[PDB]
Ligand SMILES: NC(=O)c1ccc[n+]([C@@H]2O[C@H](COP(=O)([O-])OP(=O)(O)OC[C@H]3O[C@@H](n4cnc5c(N)ncnc54)[C@H](OP(=O)(O)O)[C@@H]3O)[C@@H](O)[C@H]2O)c1
Ligand SMILES: NC(=O)c1ccc[n+]([C@@H]2O[C@H](COP(=O)([O-])OP(=O)(O)OC[C@H]3O[C@@H](n4cnc5c(N)ncnc54)[C@H](OP(=O)(O)O)[C@@H]3O)[C@@H](O)[C@H]2O)c1
């Protein structure tokens with residue numbers, strides 16, 4: 196195909212928590228559909244760490260249609276699209292615009308396009324806005340055959356565009372609904388591992404205890420997650436395997452864990468005392484505990500010689516608070532299994548795996 | 561070795577909920593280590609359904625040592641022992657004597673014995689008798705590396721005899737701790753699927769609704785189980801694969817379910833109405849409402865031409881009562897996964913598959 200590649204990927208959201216994994220996994224010689232040529236699209240200018248990646252980086256505001264057409268239409272060789280991004284808000288039309296503009300720019304020009312992977316999430320099973328009355332969310336373990344809830348969810352819009360555009364043209368599709376993503380990206384708007392690692396790094400820096408600010412339920416309830424590299428495996432799988440073509444597929448590690456056990460590992464990996472859930476104590480907003488704490492992070496990045504990140508950029512404490520008030524949100528991976536996908540991760544090891552990687556990439560050690 | 565077999569299995573507890581699966585899985589040509597010769601042991605005289613199997617049945621009371629020597633010592637060809645039985649009570653020593661008498665009989669006589677699979681269970685993680693005050697069990701997800709609880713448990717006695725006897729001789733070993741077993745045996749003391757099916761069959765017979773008698777928690781909590789065939793696959797795996805030798809291994813379906821969803825499928829498969837958990841209602845002994853109900857079952861077996869089974873023999877309502885006042889007992893299959901075992905079951909499909917199979921063998925409808 197191109198030069199002498201077998202497949203050419205277009206990772207939209209390459210700086211993302213999943214997009215970064217695709218930027219590594221795709222370039223492996225063992226990766227199916229290889230050898231892979233990878234285009235990586237993000238809004239920000241290419242960071243230092245992604246410059247060290249064998250990926251044709253593309254700086255484009257996908258919300259801007261004319262800019263998208265200008266930068267993507269020359270890419271005649273694209274074979275698989277991995278839409279792994281979102282605007283940063285739950286705005287349905289702005290998110291749809293991005294996805295539309297990708298398809299509007301590539302489909303007519305890419306003469307050998309085959310597949311489009313659309314990544315959404317488990318929120319497709321329980322998304323609710325105006326809380327205080329009706330519309331009851333689905334019960335878990337969530338299965339892909341569950342119908343949409345009567346609410347505005349941009350996941351709906353994205354699927355609609357996906358189903359239609361991949362229908363008008365002889366294209367295959369695949370919808371991926373990952374669980375909580377354990378990743379390493381420092382520029383994700385939702386990186387739970389980096390967030391908790393930052394909180395840990397700061398607790399240690401001030402010689403304070405790693406205090407669990409969450410709820411009683413989230414401390415003891417069964418929770419599930421998914422390694423970012425696995426979501427990469429799962430999306431690549433659906434991209435090349437006929438068995439997974441035109442299918443909606445969940446994606447988790449295959450196991451369950453508890454935050455009480457994660458919290459201990461987090462403290463052990465940092466060598467500090469931890470304060471687990473106190474009986475009777477109510478949840479405290481970690482976003483409040485870490486407000487006005489940026490200078491402390493600025494200092495840490497200097498003193499520890501870490502890759503320059505701002506606290507707002509690498510940590511989403513609001514996202515932790517939500518996860519720490521969430522129970523009964525486990526998804527099923529039977530479908531992918533029965534379709535032949537045998538990918539799994541020990542969630543406990545995966546968490547440490549993400550800590551170690553962000554240490555290796557100088558985001559946190 | 562024998563006749564023209566590569567492996568000769570001694571299944572101890574062949575009429576059991578797992579032993580009966582082993583009686584089927586082992587005789588398949590696909591099964592690793594094949595072709596298998598199978599000796600099957602139980603205290604009762606061979607049932608009609610086991611008579612229809614290619615398994616050398618041996619009626620022996622293993623609690624009797626001299627009897628065990630008399631019937632097992634002439635089996636010079638045994639290669640693998642699958643101890644999948646228990647006395648019926650929590651009696652440590654009485655359970656131990658059985659496992660002893662097996663090893664005391666076969667080991668000196670079987671000159672090509674290689675492996676001994678010991679099946680126990682997840683009660684290794686939460687066995688308690690004086691549950692009114694002190695002594696606290698482990699927390700889930702249960703892992704194999706969890707230390708024994710300071711409580712008399714015959715699982716400990718079995719492992720000790722296992723570790724020692726497999727040490728004195730040059731034998732491998734494997735401890736299996738299955739979760740709730742979804743099986744088909746009509747002569748098991750703990751068959752949760754046959755029990756609930758029997759209850760459903762009776763509710764249908766009297767034109768009554770399938771009323772959930774359990775607790776609120778067990779209705780909503782995540783639960784896990786294991787297909788008996790999977791346990792058979794998992795023990796056979798540990799008996800032929802060097803990666804699994806000398807290892808403690810849990811055994812579940814790899815997923816989680818809820819009883820509220822199982823209960824609905826049970827009503828659907830029997831085509832009757834059902835009453836789920838009622839808010840405020842408390843658990844009712846299924847054993848109590850099914851007592852003085854054996855007269856009805858004797859009639860049902862006749863009218864439906866079912867295989868002659870007494871109510872107390874095929875159903876353990878006390879065991880259902882226990883399952884319906886339980887939660888937080890999920891085990892981890894990560895260890896077996898990482899060792900290479902990729903066996904899994906959709907627990908929902910497994911449960912229906914067990915209903916279907918017992919209908920095929922005329923234990924039900
Ligand atoms: N995060 C999780 O734990 C998680 C878990 C389950 C499901 N999901 C879902 O998976 C989907 C993917 O989200 P994610 O978590 O992968 O996102 P992420 O890791 O926060 O990264 C988002 C990517 O999109 C790019 N982007 C955002 N706005 C853009 C624009 N206007 N133009 C061009 N590029 C833009 C970003 O690049 P810049 O750096 O330039 O902004 C970034 O690379 C989301 O729908 C999310 O709901 C996420
Ligand atoms: N049942 C479950 O759902 C479950 C789940 C997880 C773990 N486990 C554990 O797995 C282990 C195996 O139990 P299981 O469920 O396989 O038992 P089971 O299905 O109730 O069957 C027990 C077997 O042992 C035989 N047996 C009993 N006493 C005997 C004696 N004195 N001499 C010879 N044979 C005898 C029985 O044959 P007869 O019919 O002749 O007595 C029967 O075939 C147990 O430790 C149990 O705790 C069970």
Ligand SMILES: C/C(C=O)=C\CC/C(C)=C/C=O
Pocket residue numbers: 315316317318319374375385517518519520521524
């Ligand atoms: C809901 C939750 C913790 O409550 C985590 C999931 C967040 C995400 C991105 C779900 C997929 O849209």
Ligand SMILES: C/C(C=O)=C\CC/C(C)=C/C=O
Pocket residue numbers: 680681682683684739740750882883884885886
């Ligand atoms: C404990 C329980 C429901 O409470 C189910 C497990 C029963 C068994 C046989 C566990 C293995 O010892």
